[PDB]
Amino acid sequence: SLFKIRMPETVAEGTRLALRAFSLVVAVDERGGIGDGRSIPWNVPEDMKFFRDVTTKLRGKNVKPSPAKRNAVVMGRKTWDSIPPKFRPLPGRLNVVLSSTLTTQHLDSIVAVNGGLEQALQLLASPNYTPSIETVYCIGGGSVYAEALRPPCVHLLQAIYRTTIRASESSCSVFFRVPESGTEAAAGIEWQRETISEELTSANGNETKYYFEKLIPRNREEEQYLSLVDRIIREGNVKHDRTGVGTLSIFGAQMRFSLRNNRLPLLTTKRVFWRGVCEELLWFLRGETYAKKLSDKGVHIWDDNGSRAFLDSRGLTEYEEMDLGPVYGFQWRHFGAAYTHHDANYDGQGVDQIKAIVETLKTNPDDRRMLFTAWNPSALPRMALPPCHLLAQFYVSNGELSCMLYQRSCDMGLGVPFNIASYALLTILIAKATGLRPGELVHTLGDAHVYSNHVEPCNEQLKRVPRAFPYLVFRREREFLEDYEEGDMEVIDYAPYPPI
Amino acid sequence: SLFKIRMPETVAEGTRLALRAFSLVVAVDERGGIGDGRSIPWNVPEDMKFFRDVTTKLRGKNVKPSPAKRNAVVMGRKTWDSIPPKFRPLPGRLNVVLSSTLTTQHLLDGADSIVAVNGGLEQALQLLASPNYTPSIETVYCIGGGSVYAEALRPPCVHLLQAIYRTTIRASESSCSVFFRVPESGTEAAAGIEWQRETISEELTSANGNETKYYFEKLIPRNREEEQYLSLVDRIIREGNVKHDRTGVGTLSIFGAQMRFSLRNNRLPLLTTKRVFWRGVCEELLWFLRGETYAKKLSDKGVHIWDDNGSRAFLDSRGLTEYEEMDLGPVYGFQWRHFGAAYTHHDANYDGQGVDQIKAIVETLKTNPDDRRMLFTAWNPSALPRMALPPCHLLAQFYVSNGELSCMLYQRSCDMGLGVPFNIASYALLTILIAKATGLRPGELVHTLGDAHVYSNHVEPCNEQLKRVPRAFPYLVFRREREFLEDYEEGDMEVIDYAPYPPI
Lengths: 500, 504
Ligand SMILES: NC(=O)c1ccc[n+]([C@@H]2O[C@H](COP(=O)([O-])OP(=O)(O)OC[C@H]3O[C@@H](n4cnc5c(N)ncnc54)[C@H](OP(=O)(O)O)[C@@H]3O)[C@@H](O)[C@H]2O)c1
Ligand SMILES: NC(=O)c1ccc[n+]([C@@H]2O[C@H](COP(=O)([O-])OP(=O)(O)OC[C@H]3O[C@@H](n4cnc5c(N)ncnc54)[C@H](OP(=O)(O)O)[C@@H]3O)[C@@H](O)[C@H]2O)c1
Ligand SMILES: CCOC(=O)CCCOc1cc(NCc2ccc3nc(N)nc(N)c3c2)ccc1OC
Ligand SMILES: CCOC(=O)CCCOc1cc(NCc2ccc3nc(N)nc(N)c3c2)ccc1OC
Description:
The structure is a homodimer.
Chain A: E1 22-29, E2 33-35, H1 45-56, E3 70-76, H2 77-82, E4 93-98, E5 110-113, H3 117-123, E6 133-140, H4 142-148, E7 157-166, E8 174-175, E9 191-196, E10 200-201, E11 209-217, H5 220-235, E12 237-240, E13 246-258, H6 274-285, H7 292-295, H8 303-306, H9 308-313, H10 329-334, H11 353-363, E14 371-373, E15 389-397, E16 400-411, H12 415-434, E17 437-451, H13 455-461, E18 471-474, E19 489-492
Parallel strand pairs in A: 1-6, 1-7, 3-4, 3-6, 4-5, 16-17
Antiparallel strand pairs in A: 2-8, 7-11, 9-11, 10-11, 12-13, 13-17, 14-15, 15-16, 18-19
The complex binds NADP nicotinamide-adenine-dinucleotide phosphate (NAP) (2 copies) and the ligand CCOC(=O)CCCOc1cc(NCc2ccc3nc(N)nc(N)c3c2)ccc1OC (2 copies).
């Protein structure tokens, strides 16, 4: 259509292919030895059990692994050779073998990959594997672990499950060490001990001592969110909202989130309603104002503010139910245009801020005026609500598009994580529209608050260790920005905590 | 005046200076001793000279102390007694003497250069805060005895202590029974203040017949707020991206930053490491507040900051060929007071046209301080092409807690060298004025920066500025008030105790 924004013919320079996140499972001795090059020297049945259990089990309670939903184990060919023929393939799991020589048919529970772990992580990110494969485990061996600890794979590592066997084995010629936080080899990742078992003794007849630990990469960006929540609780002033409900509040804060390689800052310590986020954002981008378009895909976030009662209380007696007035996206695409009803034609009316930004980004990336706003004092009384996230500015450095969001009023529990996700998506889409790579989201908060009745619940959430952020993958592209659908994209490896 | 904003009855109450700021001068031995209870038990003429000079001299070049402009020295009665009658009062300075028994008239029996205060340093600073002594007194110096120094180091006085000039005499006097010690960082005695050395002299020898070694130090309370600014400039120079603006001038740039400045108790965040043009700041903000668009109104007052953006050539270069010279279009203030109104020329009548954002905010601040919609903006996409320049400081949000007004500024494009310090001062003033208009006290300024940048040529200058240790901020007082916000003049307010570094 004539007033839509045409997408580029080609992807931005540098854009990666999709990659699954994975966990690493390993057994080491005290000097970091894992094997002689053909086998594992020690015999510790308890580690065998642990390795089987962790790689087999799914996040769901007592769920049985099936072709429909299972885990995948990724292994080097030599590790496949070390498994005695009668125990292979490893039951309940998709066995992924890395080999330049061997093929799948030299043997659907097995698949060969001509390439390293990166290629395996690419394969499992295919639409053929993403619905059925819940977690990917790097189970070895040495050359796979080495690759796993190396960019690009190392940034996709969710967790390391390391068993330490208290044995001295001079036959070990292959090694594995988790680089300590702050060290050069750590490559900017801060490894943390999440759990450690008590020191246990094997019933192998040698009384071999062993223990387990789970290591995770520190999610600094979510810690930044939790520190703010914690600060508000500890130091915020008591305030009351429009319905007289108590909040704890601070004024003026700022957070940052990397969107690089389509990383998606969906918070892990509380599940964020991504589908609603995505549907709403696309609805903004299209310049929509009819909330029924959202209620019909089961996104009910605007129901309360679109009701006959609420619109009437806002003086908006002429609007149909769910007609919100010239809100958000309308101002984005038609700033200043007169509003009558949602179903009217607004093509070429008001200022199309999104259109202008997309054109300036392509020709003059150093420009300092690439901002869009929904804060239109003239049109505020005509809106169901004044805009919360009201302003955004774009910035370009190193072929990466960054965005700053300004938000006047910020509910830390629900609004904030939702809006971080919205603008992450927006920045990713605008990057795609302009031939740029996604860069950084900066979030500026005005009145940042927690509900006084959510204090105890938030305190419980603050004890949770943040997990890694998921990634966003586009399964198909569109000719126009406005034609993107929620179904066009997939959030991969989002593993948030269950409800409080 | 129907369209103006009426000031409440409490207009002066929340910005009246409670205590005047002061510096401290002291001579100590190496055990922190200052005297034996009656006198100073050493004889160092070079300290006497320094003491005289630092307490007498005014900030300018060759400005002679006069009743209209001089320093004050504040002393305890015992210190006044220790001065030989021939030498008192200390010439060229207002002599403030603390005493429960001695009156102003009874002191003259031992122009108007002596005052007795019935009370301590707090009482003296209270008196010196009044219009009779502020701003005619340039710097207050505490010089008095141990009891006066002790009161200087504890709240409420200590938070107003701008500088400590300490002379150390290298002797150890058993005789000393009164002491003075500067508290170190993080200690309880320091009351959250972090004393820092600005200067230390080389060790010198006194011509007193005893070869007494001595030295001078000037200590200043760490200004963390100005250090936010300096760290940011340093970060930009170190790791900012190279960019070029519309003219093609080179820039070093980072994206997305935030700073905080306290406006409590008359504090004014005018940067000290480089002098800010306060008079310009003040004239322009008032000009903004009035919804003004004719830059000649600033020109006529010697404020030339808009001259180059209002010339015939520049307006033509933005396609604004129908504007009279200095007519900037619907810029800044016009949007604050008349958002969305159609613009023709500067001299037309805009009363009641568009949205008066400032007035709406003032009304909401008085009735519902909890409101989260208290914002104004100059970012009007439909009017941007009509403006000489689109606004860089483009949006502000107000917030209220504990009767204190805070403001958040959003700035899309920030020139760190000139624009940023100017805009901090601007929005500090705005928050102060809005607080006065709404019966609130000034709280905090929060400054959000988009494209924060330093010019590639300005790099070396900035680097020299970066090694300066920021001094304490000055204060803003009102000489008088007005019936209407729009009626405030630059001569109505006075920046006091502003001691910025020299240029270079
Ligand atoms: N303790 C533990 O936790 C643990 C776990 C697993 C294994 N292990 C031990 O690890 C030792 C063997 O490991 P190690 O690295 O020699 O062998 P490995 O990692 O098991 O396997 C290496 C083989 O995998 C394939 N491969 C790896 N990277 C590839 C790439 N980039 N492209 C194509 N193919 C690739 C190649 O097969 P082709 O030669 O066919 O091309 C390569 O020869 C054994 O002692 C085993 O028991 C220990
Ligand atoms: N080395 C230096 O830098 C330096 C400088 C100055 C003085 N000194 C030495 O300091 C020693 C004496 O100082 P010190 O404290 O005893 O004496 P001081 O501070 O000079 O004076 C104390 C007197 O000031 C008045 N005062 C103080 N606080 C008051 C309050 N809250 N309310 C009412 N009146 C108040 C009282 O006078 P009334 O009793 O009349 O009411 C009090 O007796 C001497 O040895 C002097 O030489 C050293
Ligand atoms: C006690 C050691 O003695 C043995 O090696 C068992 C005899 C061979 O039988 C098998 C070998 C393998 N090898 C791969 C392997 C083994 C243990 C691991 N543990 C951790 N923690 N992590 C691993 N990644 C891991 C990987 C896998 C399955 C087998 O049969 C079920
Ligand atoms: C080297 C000492 O020799 C004497 O004692 C001179 C004889 C007394 O004559 C005077 C005494 C005072 N006393 C107050 C005084 C003195 C020095 C100070 N220095 C610093 N750095 N700081 C002070 N606050 C200070 C305060 C003042 C003025 C006098 O006559 C001009």
